[PDB]
Amino acid sequence: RFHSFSFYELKNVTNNFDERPISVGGNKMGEGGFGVVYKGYVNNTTVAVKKLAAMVDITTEELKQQFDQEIKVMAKCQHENLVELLGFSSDGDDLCLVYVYMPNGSLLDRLSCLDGTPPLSWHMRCKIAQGAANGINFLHENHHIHRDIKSANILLDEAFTAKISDFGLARASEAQTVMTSRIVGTTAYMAPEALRGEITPKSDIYSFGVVLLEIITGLPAVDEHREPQLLLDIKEEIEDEEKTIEDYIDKKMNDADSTSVEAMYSVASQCLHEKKNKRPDIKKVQQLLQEMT
Ligand SMILES: CNc1cc(-c2ccc3cc(C#N)cnn23)ncc1C(=O)NC[C@@H](F)C(C)(C)O
Numbered sequence: 641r642f643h644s645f646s647f648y649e650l651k652n653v654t655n656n657f658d659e660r661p662i663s664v665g666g667n668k669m670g671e672g673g674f675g676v677v678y679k680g681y682v683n684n685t686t687v688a689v690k691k692l693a694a695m696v697d698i699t700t701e702e703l704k705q706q707f708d709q710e711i712k713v714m715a716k717c718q719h720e721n722l723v724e725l726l727g728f729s730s731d732g733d734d735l736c737l738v739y740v741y742m743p744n745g746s747l748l749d750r751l752s753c754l755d756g757t758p759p760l761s762w763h764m765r766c767k768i769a770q771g772a773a774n775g776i777n778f779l780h781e782n783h784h785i786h787r788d789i790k791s792a793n794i795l796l797d798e799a800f801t802a803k804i805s806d807f808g809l810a811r812a813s814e815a816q817t818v819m820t821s822r823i824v825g826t827t828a829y830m831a832p833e834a835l836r837g838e839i840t841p842k843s844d845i846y847s848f849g850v851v852l853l854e855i856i857t858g859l860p861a862v863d864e865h866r867e868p869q870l871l872l873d874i875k876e877e878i879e880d881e882e883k884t885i886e887d888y889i890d891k892k893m894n895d896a897d898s899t900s901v902e903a904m905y906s907v908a909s910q911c912l913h914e915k916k917n918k919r920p921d922i923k924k925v926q927q928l929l930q931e932m933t
Contacts (some may be wrong), residue, residue, distance in 0.1 A: 641715075641729065641797070642714075642715070642727045642817060642915060643726060643727030643738075644724070644727060644728065644729070644730075645682075645727055645728070645729045645731075645736070645738060646731045647729060647731050647732065647734065647736075649682070649729075650680065650689050650691075650729055650736050651736070653680040653681050653682060653687075653689075654667045654678040654679065654680040654689055654794050655819075656665050656677075657678055657691060658678070659676060659678075659845075661677060662784055663755055666866030666923060666925075667679045668917070669688060669745065670745075670749075670792075671695065672695065672744065672792065672806070673695045673698075674693070674694075674695065674696075674698075674808060675691050675692040675693045675695065675697035676691055676693065676695075676704060676853055677689070677690045678690075678691065678743065680738075682726070682738070682805050685726075685740070685741075686740075686741035687726065687739060687740065687741050688738070688739045688740070688741050688742065689736055689738050689762060689842070690736065690738075690739070691734060691735070691736050691738045692706070692707060692734070692735040692736070692737075692738035703735065704843050706733065706808030706809065707728070707730075707735045707737070707808065707894065709808050709809070709810055710727070710737060710793055710806075710807045710808045710810075711728060711737075713784060713807040713839075714807065716782065716931050717778065717779065717782055717784070717807075719774075719775060719778045720771075720773045720801060720803075720804055720805055721772065721778065721801070722775050722778065722803055722804050722805075723739050723740070723742070723795055723803045723804070723805040724740045724803075725737060725738070725739055726738045726740060727740060735899045739805075741754065742795040742796060742797055742803065743796075743797060743798045744757075744795075744797065744798065744800060744910050745795065745796060746791065746792050746793075746794065746795055746796070747768060747772075747791040747792075747794040747795070747802070747851070747854075747855075748790075748792040748794075748854075748860075749876050750796060751791060751855070751858050751890075752858075752860075753768045753892070759858075759890070759892035760800070760891060760893075761891060761894075761895050762895045762896035762897075762900070762901075764820045765804070765855045765856075765891075766891075766900065766904070766929075766932065767788075767800060767801075767856055767908070768794070768800060768802045768855065769802075769851075769852060769904065769929055769931075770802075770926075770929045770930065771801055771802030771803075772783065772794050772802040772804060772848065772851065773848065773922065773925050773926045773929050774806040774926060775802065775803065776789065776844055776848060776921060776922050776925075777922045777925075779804070779844075780813070780844070780866055780921075780922050781842050783812055783813045783814070784810050784811070784812065785810060785811065785812075785813050785839060785840065785841045785843070785844060786804065786806075786807070786809070786810055786844050786898070787809040787810060787811060787824060787825060787827070787839070787843065787844070788806050788809045788824070788825055789804075789829065789844050789845075789847035789848055789851065789878075790826050790829045790850070790851065790861070791861070791865025792820040792826075793805050793806040793903060795844065795852065799820070799848055808840075809825075811823050811839050812829065812841075813841050817839065817840040818835070818838070818839045818840075819836075819837045819838055820839055820914050821837065822836065822837075823836075823837055823897055825847075826861070827862075828850070828861040828862035828870055828871070828872070829847045829851075830843070830846075830847065830863055831843040831845075831846035831847065831914075831915050831916065832916070833916050834846075836876060838916075841915070841921075842919055842921075845911045845920065845921070845922060845925065846911055846916075846919065846923070847910060848853075848908070848922075848925065849872075849907075849908045849912035849919075850871060850872055850908075850912070851910035851924070852904060852905075852907060852911065853871050853872065853874060853875075853883050853908050853912075854869050854871065855873070856885065856888070856889060856890065856901060856903070856904055856905060856908065857888045857890050858890030858892060859871055859890075860886070860893075866868045867896045870904070872912060874888055875908075875909055875912050875914070885901060885902060885905040886898065886901070889901065891900055898921035900932055900933070902928075903928075903931075903932040904932060906928075907928045907929060907932070908927075910928075911925060913916060
C-alpha cells in the first residue's frame, strides 16, 4: 500500500517545485506531455515527484483518469523491472505521484550520454533489454497493455536494472482488439494499428522493437536533421540489402561482438513486423533475449 502526502511536503522538498533543470541548480529531472518530474527527498529517501500537467492538449478529466489508472496499475503490479510508486497527493487541484528515485535516469538520456555520463557498454545494454522485456512480460501476464513503450519511459537504477514507467495510458487486455477515438503515444515508436486507434498488446511489442534499435545504434527514434528521419526505417534499408546492421552499430562501445548484436537485431526485426499478427508475443521475445547471452 501507498502513502497520502499533501503538497506542503512535496512542494517544500522539491524546492517549491523548482522547474529549472537539475544541471543548472533546479529540481527538474525530466518532463513529458503529462507533467514534470522533480527530484525530492522524503525522510532519508531520494524520490522522484511527478506533478501532473496538461503539457499537451488534454482534459483535466483525462489527467485525473490517468492519475487513477497509474495508482490502480501500480497497486496491482510489483516487480523489479517496474518503477516503484511510494504514494501520491490529490490534495487540491494538483496531482502528484511519488516514486523511488532512479540514479541513472532514463535509457533515452543514457543512450544520449546526456550530462556527460559514460556510454553504456554492450554488456549493460543486453541486461537492460532483458530487463525491459521481463517487465513488459509481467504487465501482459497481468493483462495490462502499456501503450506508451519508449526509451524515455525505461528508467535505470544504480546497477542499470531496467524499470518500465508511466502507466497512466494502460488498458486491460482480454476476445478481440478494440478501438478508441483518442490516439495516444509517441508516433516514432508506434505500431501501424496503434496509430489507427487499435488497442492491442501486439503494439507494445512493436514499440519494444524500436527501443531495441535505439539500444543497438544509439540513434534517436526520430531526428529531423537526420536521414532517414525515423529509426524504424533502418530495417527497410538493411532488408533491401543496401546496408547491414553493422553499418549502424553504436560506436561508443568496445565490447560488442557481431554475433550477439545480430541476435538482438534479429529480435528487433521480428518485433517490427508491420503485420501485427506476425510478431512474437512477449514471452517469445523474452526467451529470445535470454538465449542471446
Ligand atoms: C527522468 N529522470 C529521472 C526519473 C526518475 C524516476 C524514478 C521513478 C520515476 C517514475 C516516473 C513516472 N511516471 C518518472 N521518472 N521517474 N528518477 C530519476 C531521474 C533522473 O533524472 N536521475 C538522474 C540521473 F539521470 C543522473 C544522475 C545521471 O543525472
